[PDB]
Structures are given as C-alpha cells and as structure tokens.
Amino acid sequence: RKEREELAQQYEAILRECGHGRFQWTLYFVLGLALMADGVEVFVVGFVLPSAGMLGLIVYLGMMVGAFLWGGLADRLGRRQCLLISLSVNSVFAFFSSFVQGYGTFLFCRLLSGVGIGGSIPIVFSYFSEFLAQEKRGEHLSWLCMFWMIGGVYAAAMAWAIIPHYGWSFQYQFHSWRVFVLVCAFPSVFAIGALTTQPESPRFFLENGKHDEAWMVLKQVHDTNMRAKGHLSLGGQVWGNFLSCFGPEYRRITLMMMGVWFTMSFSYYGLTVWFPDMIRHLQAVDYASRGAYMVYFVSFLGTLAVLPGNIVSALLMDKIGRLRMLAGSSVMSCVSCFFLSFGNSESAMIALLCLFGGVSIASWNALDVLTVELYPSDKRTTAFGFLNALCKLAAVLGISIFTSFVGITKAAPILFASAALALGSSLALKLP
Numbered sequence: 001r002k003e004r005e006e007l008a009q010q011y012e013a014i015l016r017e018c019g020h021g022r023f024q025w026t027l028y029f030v031l032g033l034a035l036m037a038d039g040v041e042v043f044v045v046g047f048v049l050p051s052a053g054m055l056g057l058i059v060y061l062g063m064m065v066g067a068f069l070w071g072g073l074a075d076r077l078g079r080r081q082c083l084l085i086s087l088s089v090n091s092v093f094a095f096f097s098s099f100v101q102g103y104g105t106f107l108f109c110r111l112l113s114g115v116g117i118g119g120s121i122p123i124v125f126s127y128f129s130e131f132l133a134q135e136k137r138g139e140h141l142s143w144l145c146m147f148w149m150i151g152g153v154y155a156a157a158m159a160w161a162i163i164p165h166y167g168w169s170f171q172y173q174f175h176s177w178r179v180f181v182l183v184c185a186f187p188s189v190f191a192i193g194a195l196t197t198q199p200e201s202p203r204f205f206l207e208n209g210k211h212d213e214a215w216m217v218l219k220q221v222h223d224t225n226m227r228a229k230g231h232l233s234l235g236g237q238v239w240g241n242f243l244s245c246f247g248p249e250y251r252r253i254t255l256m257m258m259g260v261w262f263t264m265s266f267s268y269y270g271l272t273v274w275f276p277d278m279i280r281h282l283q284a285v286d287y288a289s290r291g292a293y294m295v296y297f298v299s300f301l302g303t304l305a306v307l308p309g310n311i312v313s314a315l316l317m318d319k320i321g322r323l324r325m326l327a328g329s330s331v332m333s334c335v336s337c338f339f340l341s342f343g344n345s346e347s348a349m350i351a352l353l354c355l356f357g358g359v360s361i362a363s364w365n366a367l368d369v370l371t372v373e374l375y376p377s378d379k380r381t382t383a384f385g386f387l388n389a390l391c392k393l394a395a396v397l398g399i400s401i402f403t404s405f406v407g408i409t410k411a412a413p414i415l416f417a418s419a420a421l422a423l424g425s426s427l428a429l430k431l432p
C-alpha cells in the first residue's frame, strides 16, 4: 500500500541522485551482447534451420517455454543471476549442437539452447531498467533494440561466409556448418563473460529484503558515475507472481498488453521470414519467364533502416509519450505493411520492407518501454517474460502461416499482417 509507493519514490530519488552516463552506458553494452545473442539465435532458427517441414519452429516453442520460465524465476532469484543462468544454458547447448552427429540430436540440443535464450529479452529489459531513472528510461531502453539487429546481421554474415552452401548434414566430421554453429555461440559467450562483471540490480535486492546488498550496488553506480565524471515452493511463488498479473489491478493492462504484443510479433516475424521467400519466388518466376548473401544484404539494409526510426523513437519518446508513440507508430506500421503489397519487383520490395522496419521499430521501442513502465519490480520480469512468450508463440503462428502462403497467394500475408497490426494498434490505443 503506502510502503510500495514510498519505496518506489525513494528508489527513483536515489537513482536520480546516482547520476547517469558511465555505469549505465557500460551495462548497456554488457546487455546488448545478450540481446545480440538473442537475435543470433532467432536468425539461426528462422533462416538457417530450414537450411537443414518447419522443424526449426520447435526452437520457438523452446524459446516460449524458456521466456516464461526464466522470466518467472528472475523475479525471485535475481535479474543478473537468472540472466547468467539462461545465457549459460544457451551457450552450452549451442556449443554442444556442433559436436553432435545427427539432426534428431542437433535439433534437440538446439531446442535447449533456444530455451536458454528465451529468457534474454525479458530479463535484459527488466534488468537494465532497474538502473535507469525516469527521465532517461525510455530513451536508454530504446537503444537496446538495435543490438538485436546487430546480432541478426552478425548471424547472416557468418552464414553467408561459412555456410553460403545449402549443404548441412551431420553424420564424416569437422564440417563447416559446425564452425558456423560454434561461431554463433560467440556473442552468447561474450555476453555471459561480460555479465559476470555487472552487479545484480539494487531494486531486486531491496525487494528481496537485502538492503545492504542493494546499497552496495547503488554506491557502485554512484561511484562509477562520479569518479568518471570527476572527483519447489519457488514454483508456487512464481505462480503467485503470474496470477497477480491478472489481478484486479493488472487484468485490463495484462490483457490489452498481451493482445498488442501478440499481434505485433505475429505480424513482424511472419513478414520478415516470409519476405526472403517472396523474393526467392519472385526471382525464380522471373528466371522461369526467361543466395544466403541476399538474406545477408536485406538483413544489413533492414538494420540500417530501423536506425533512423530507432534514433527518433529513443530521442522523442520522453516527450511524445510512450502511449502516444506506441499508438501512432503501430498505425504507421499497419499502413506501411498494407503498402508492402505494391512492391511488384524485388528491387522495390526490399525498400517497402525497409519502410516497414523503419516505421515499426518505434512501436517496438514504445512497447518494450511500456511493458516495464506498467509493471512493478515485484512482478516486472514475470510479466515481461510472459508477454515475450506470447511474442514467441505469435512468431510461430506468423512464420508458419505466411510461409504456407508464399506462392499460392500473392498479397495474402500482406493483408493478414495489415489486419493483425490494425488489431494490435486498436488495442495499443486503449492502454493507460
């Protein structure tokens, strides 16, 4: 009641006293490594597992399980400790999958690494947010979403360089897809190695009755900023946390948030996995009328296209508003997806999905900052993790359907995603 509000006000006051600029900008990279690992795994699942009947979409079920699990645990065990555990699991099994002599065993040891990386985004966003003050929280949570694209481009370049060929078979030994799989673990290994040097969030320590082990974290933040400026029953506890997200105070918020998350993720993941298929079909039909580098090129161009949108969102959200930014950017993403149909030619279709990405990254940034503004640290990571599990389910729902529609229908998935984003924007415009 009064204790929670007093704690939130006092923690915001102390966090604003600690200052911003050095500790936060270091933890930003330390956690961007984890997000880059997330993007790497997502790329390998969506655009490299088919290269070996949509059996690669089992890794997304793994990721949904892992997101829910690690998100729920991170609110009881710690944001940093559970980020360590999740990244460690992902890294160990991404390592394993390269030494494995099959696909029935490679897919399992990669499903478990997908489970690992499932809980990266919820914990990273809930963990970085415990260190950021109110007037910088949105702007500095918006820069994280670029590391996802950086990880995706990393994965695409490694694929095009080590395994540009479609040959991917496990039996011989010391292949070149094994080298790729090992090399795609590197962002995760660095993320965990760097993350073992950042302190667990002070908000979590305060919530966990650890006032001293929170004061040490806070004094570290202050000293780092200034010197550089100058001078089980645990399952029952996680269930309580989750069933609170649908209490009288969070049922409305949680349901509308679930809808926005699910629809945005459905549209985005379906569209982005379909678009290379659309390009390949377009060029195959063009050839009939008369590889991995194409996916790398479009990955690079998309990573550059979300850039101005990410910068504008990050710099503006503190004044345009998180609710308003989410609503407007979701409307713009809907309309740009509707326009995506016109790009009759590949040369023009690349640019229309560039537009989709550029105008939709602002909605994603607003969503990720809003799902941390609307929940308390007592349940922030559980709520974020559940909503990210919904995002992974949407990603399967969207990648399966749209891939099914590749050739048989021309502007089917464009219209599916336009309607989905319209529903998502309708829900987003209603949030508090």
Ligand SMILES: CC(C)CCC[C@@H](C)[C@H]1CC[C@H]2[C@@H]3CC=C4C[C@@H](O)CC[C@]4(C)[C@H]3CC[C@]12C
Pocket (backbone or CB within 6 Å): 308, 309, 310, 312, 313, 320, 324, 325, 326, 328, 329, 332, 354, 355, 358, 359, 360, 361, 362
């Ligand atoms: C190179 C191009 C494609 C980059 C485009 C960047 C996007 C993300 C930018 C450009 C103009 C921006 C919009 C300008 C003004 C507003 C105010 C209000 O209505 C809510 C957000 C909204 C609607 C902004 C959302 C983000 C926005 C759509």
Ligand SMILES: *[C]O(*)C1(*)(*)=[C@@](*)(*)[C@@](*)(*)=C(*)(*)C(*)(*)=C1(*)(*)[N@](*)(*)[C@](*)(=O*)[C](*)C(*)(*)(*)([C]*)[C](*)C1(*)(*)=[C@@](*)(*)C(*)(*)([C]*)=[C@](*)(*)C(*)(*)(*)([C])=[C@]1(*)*
Pocket (backbone or CB within 6 Å): 039, 040, 042, 043, 148, 149, 150, 151, 152, 153, 272, 273, 275, 276, 298, 299, 300, 301, 302, 303, 305, 350, 353, 354, 355, 356, 357, 358
């Ligand atoms: C580089 O983006 C990422 C990030 C993580 C995983 C994969 C990946 N690449 C893709 O999904 C392939 C898409 C075609 C990239 C893309 C996305 C958007 C919104 C616009 C463009 C032009 C390309």
Ligand SMILES: CCC[C@@H]1CC(=O)N([C@@H](CC)C(N)=O)C1
Pocket (backbone or CB within 6 Å): 035, 121, 144, 145, 148, 268, 306, 357, 360, 361, 364, 365, 368
């Ligand atoms: C335009 C790119 C949107 C991507 C898709 C995705 O899944 N993103 C994560 C970033 C941690 C998110 N906002 O949840 C961002």
